[PDB]
Amino acid sequence: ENLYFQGHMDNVDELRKIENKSSFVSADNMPEYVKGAFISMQDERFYNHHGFDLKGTTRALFSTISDRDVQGGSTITQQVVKNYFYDNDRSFTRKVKELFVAHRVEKQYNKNEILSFYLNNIYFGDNQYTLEGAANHYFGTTVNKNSTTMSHITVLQSAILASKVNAPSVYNINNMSENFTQRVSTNLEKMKQQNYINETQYQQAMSQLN
Ligand SMILES: C=C(C/C=C(/C)CCC=C(C)C)CCC(C)(C)/C=C/CC/C(C)=C\CO[C@H](COP(=O)(O)O[C@H]1O[C@H](C(N)=O)[C@@](C)(O)[C@H](OC(N)=O)[C@H]1O[C@@H]1O[C@H](CO[C@@H]2O[C@H](CO)[C@@H](O)[C@H](O)[C@H]2O)[C@@H](O[C@@H]2O[C@H](C)[C@@H](O[C@@H]3O[C@H](C(=O)NC4=C(O)C=CC4=O)[C@H](O)[C@H](O)[C@H]3O)[C@H](O)[C@H]2NC(C)=O)[C@H](O)[C@H]1NC(C)=O)C(=O)O
């Protein structure tokens, strides 16, 4: 139930209402590896593109025979639009409208604002529509880098949540399927390759996962 934070997007300022969520946490207030868990898994060149990543997608496709640089179907900006629009059936017309509106979102907002709308208005499972709500509910940890009161979200937990949003009703944190732990393992490897974490952090996280 997140209907209030959804709409038809008559104006892109409708996304500003996500800022009034009680568990809202700004991207600026999160540790880099937390944001990197999502960026690395969903849209590696998030900061560099204008919501479409046409160049990087085309290179990943035709520069190498390997699928090493191939990413998922949607940039974070496209995921923000899809999650702001009311729940609906997935089709090429709705995807096309989302692409169009993503261009309007990129024009108005900076990358940290877009990333804040992303992490505070996507489904993580168990009625959690914010990254802070999810970290609290699942681990009792926090994504606010300034907290002196609460245990800080780990590298592993950040990767678990960044992978979880692809199938939040299916991927189960308590009883992780082989597929879910493969997704998380790949997420940890991408965080390392994209320099959000180091070998120490990576091994500690892989050890904890295993
Ligand atoms: C330009 C051209 C070129 C064309 C031509 C012709 C050439 C032209 C040339 C010329 C002219 C010369 C056109 C091509 C172009 C533009 C590229 C077009 C492409 C076409 C693409 C197509 C075909 C379609 C577009 O759509 C596709 C598909 O869209 P999605 O399905 O939305 O996207 C998912 O898949 C993508 C993918 N396949 O790549 C993805 C990986 O990119 C998405 O990942 C991310 N990160 O976005 C992935 O999204 C996730 O999908 C989950 C659902 O997965 C799907 O589940 C289906 C089953 O229902 C399966 O059949 C699908 O296979 C599977 O993908 C989202 O999770 C859902 O989130 C909801 C909020 C949950 O609902 C809530 O659940 C709650 C609950 O209690 N849940 C529970 C708990 O919490 C615990 C137990 C529970 O039960 C409550 O019940 C509540 O009431 C309820 O509302 C719901 O339960 C939950 N579902 C699951 C399975 O977890 C989850 O929230 C959602 N994440 C986000 C951030 O949006 C697309 O956009 O790619």
Author numbering: 59 to 268
Which lines from the publication concern this structure?
The PGT module is found in two different families of PG synthases; as a single domain in monofunctional glycosyltransferases (MGTs) and as the N-terminal domain of the bifunctional class A penicillin-binding proteins (PBPs). The PGT domain adopts an all α-helical globular fold with an extended groove that divides this domain into two subdomains—a large head subdomain containing features similar to the bacteriophage λ-lysozyme and a small jaw subdomain containing features specific to the glycosyltransferase family 51 (GT51).
The difference map produced by the phenix.polder tool in PHENIX shows for the first time a complete C25 moenocinol lipid tail of MoeADON modelled into the structure. Additional electron density was observed in the groove accommodating ring A of MoeADON which is consistent with a non-ionic surfactant: glyceryl monolaurate used during cell lysis procedure. Our analyses also revealed a large positive electron density extending from the bound phosphate ion at the base of the jaw subdomain (His107 to Leu112), along the external surface, connecting to an additional area of positive electron density at the mouth of a deep pocket just below the catalytic site. This deep pocket is surrounded by the conserved residues in what we now define as motif I (Asp101, His107, Gly109, Asp111), motif II (Gln129, Gly130, Gly131, Ser132, Thr133, Gln136) and motif III (Lys153), suggesting its functional significance. Saccharide rings C, D, E and the C25 moenocinol lipid tail could not be modelled due to a lack of significant difference density. The overall electron density suggested that sections of a second MoeA molecule (i.e. MoeAJAW) bound to the jaw subdomain could be modelled at this site.
